[PDB]
């Protein structure tokens, strides 16, 4: 199905902070609202990019459509299951198999499909024992991207109505992350209902409907090209860089944060 938010707001309440973690007693007594008149509107099969300063409450926004946090002020439609990949990548005791068709009854081709999609082929291939390859809780020895690709195939593979994609692309393998955001998000994905936490652009010129917070606000809502006419000065600082979709994670929400700094 689709997902609506008109006017939600949301407060720290004791637990949350305690749940995010996987002072805020301080921000849970003044009362101050984690989200603010947060307002979007997705479509059955339409993609939503969100972005903007480090410590904007997006994973948070993810939690309230989770029902982890819930909505003060506002209404929020959705429905059906929905399947969330946070920003850790988590990995159990048992094979690379297992780890993504665990708890969903298994489909020879869904799964191929996903894990070709998502770029594991390139990896599982190294291993002598193929996806049949045996991790130990963590995956410790694995790479950052590794582990995240991981991460997302179990998410895509779970048949849902929406998908939450909290920051998977934020590695150093950027090439493969460009190739996994293709053909799993834009292709394999294009006719699911997706959210998607993110610091490349690449994803916001590719979405259905944009969405910027800042300090707890929204600081932009709209598709693409709004987004050039409606925000000038944010949209011109940032299609300034030649290749910014491939400098650190970091790097990138150092920019997001100081360029929305400025013209806040
Ligand atoms: N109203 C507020 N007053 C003071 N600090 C706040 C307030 N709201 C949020 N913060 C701070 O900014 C953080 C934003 O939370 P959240 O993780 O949901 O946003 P986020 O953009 O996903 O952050 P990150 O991208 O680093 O995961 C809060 O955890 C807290 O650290
Ligand atoms: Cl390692
Ligand atoms: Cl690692
Ligand atoms: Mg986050």
Excluded at 15 to 24: C, T, V
Excluded at 29 to 37: I, Y
Excluded at 168 to 174: A, H, K, S, T
């Amino acid at each position: 199905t689709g997902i609506i938010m008109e006017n939600v707001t949301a407060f720290w309440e004791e637990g949350f902070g305690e749940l995010l973690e996987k002072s805020f007693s301080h921000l849970c007594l003044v009362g101050n609202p984690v989200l603010k008149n947060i307002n979007l509107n997705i479509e059955k099969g339409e993609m939503l990019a969100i972005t903007g300063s480090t410590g904007s409450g997006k994973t948070s926004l993810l939690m309230l459509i989770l029902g982890e946090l819930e909505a003060s002020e506002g209404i929020i439609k959705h429905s059906g299951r929905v399947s969330f990949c946070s920003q850790f990548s988590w990995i159990m005791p048992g094979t690379i198999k297992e780890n993504i068709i665990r708890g969903v009854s298994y489909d020879e081709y869904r799964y191929k499909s996903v894990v070709k999609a998502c770029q594991l082929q390139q990896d599982i291939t190294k291993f002598a024992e193929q996806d049949n390859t045996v991790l130990g809780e963590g995956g410790v020895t694995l790479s950052g991207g590794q582990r995240a690709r991981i991460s997302l195939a179990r998410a895509v593979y779970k048949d849902a109505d929406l998908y939450l994609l909290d920051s998977p692309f934020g590695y150093l393998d950027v090439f493969t992350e460009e190739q996994v955001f293709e053909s799993c998000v834009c292709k394999l994905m294009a006719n699911k209902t997706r959210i998607l936490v993110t610091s490349k652009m690449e994803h916001l010129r590719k979405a259905d409907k944009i969405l910027i917070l800042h300090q707890g606000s929204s600081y932009f809502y709209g598709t693409f090209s709004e987004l050039q006419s409606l925000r000038p000065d944010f949209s011109s600082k940032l299609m300034g860089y030649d290749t910014f979709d491939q400098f650190t994670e970091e790097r990138r929400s150092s920019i997001l944060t100081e360029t929305l700094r400025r013209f806040s």
